Design an enzyme around this catalytic site. Structure first.
Site: not given
Length: 189
Positions: A72, A76, A85, A125, A135, A170, A176
């Protein structure tokens, strides 16, 4: 090429992580530039941006993105409380990350319609350790590797649909990959 970790380079926050499989390198360049080169990698994420991000940042990105397989290219990042996320996906390789996901609407921004989705990661994680969390996705219909992302348009559309964000952690432009090959060179501002 640099060690996986986070930090600052030429004014920009950066994050580079991998699963230790091998087959991927990440380099920081001048200003907001970073490059990723990978060949039969494992799982990784690398990019530059901000810590913390904001909910009305206009993010500019430009360069080249040449995945061969699952990868990807996205804005992000994460929120906390709730832990989320999120992705504003500008391009991808062989796999559309919304495949099979529940569609939660559409938003038009920066020259394309995006489809909106919510998914759930179970015991995966995260920035706070292993967790179950949602997400949020905006997936651009018209793929590109340069442009401008008005994040507020996405975050507002998400909020309208019941996809609420907590406090920003962040926020980066990230390449990715999941067990693929490719090269990318991206400049953020």
């Amino acid at each position: 090429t640099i060690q996986p970790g986070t930090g600052y380079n030429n004014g920009y926050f950066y994050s580079y992580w991998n699963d230790g499989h091998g087959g991927v390198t990440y380099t920081n360049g001048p200003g907001g530039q970073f490059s990723v080169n990978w060949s039969n990698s494992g799982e990784f994420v690398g990019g530059k941006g901000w810590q913390p991000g904001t909910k009305n940042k206009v993010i500019n990105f430009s360069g080249s993105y040449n995945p061969n397989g699952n990868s990807y290219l996205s804005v992000y990042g994460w929120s906390r409380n709730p832990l989320i996320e999120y992705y504003i996906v500008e391009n991808f390789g062989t796999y559309n990350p919304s495949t099979g996901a529940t569609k939660l609407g559409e938003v038009t921004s920066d020259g394309s319609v995006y489809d909106i989705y919510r998914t759930q990661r179970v015991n995966q994680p995260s920035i706070i350790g292993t967790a179950t969390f949602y997400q949020y996705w905006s997936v651009r219909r018209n793929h590109r590797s340069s442009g401008s992302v008005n994040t507020a348009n996405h975050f507002n559309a998400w909020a309208q649909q019941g996809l609420t964000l907590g406090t920003m952690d962040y926020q980066i432009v990230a390449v990715e990959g999941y067990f693929s090959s490719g090269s990318a060179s991206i400049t953020v501002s």
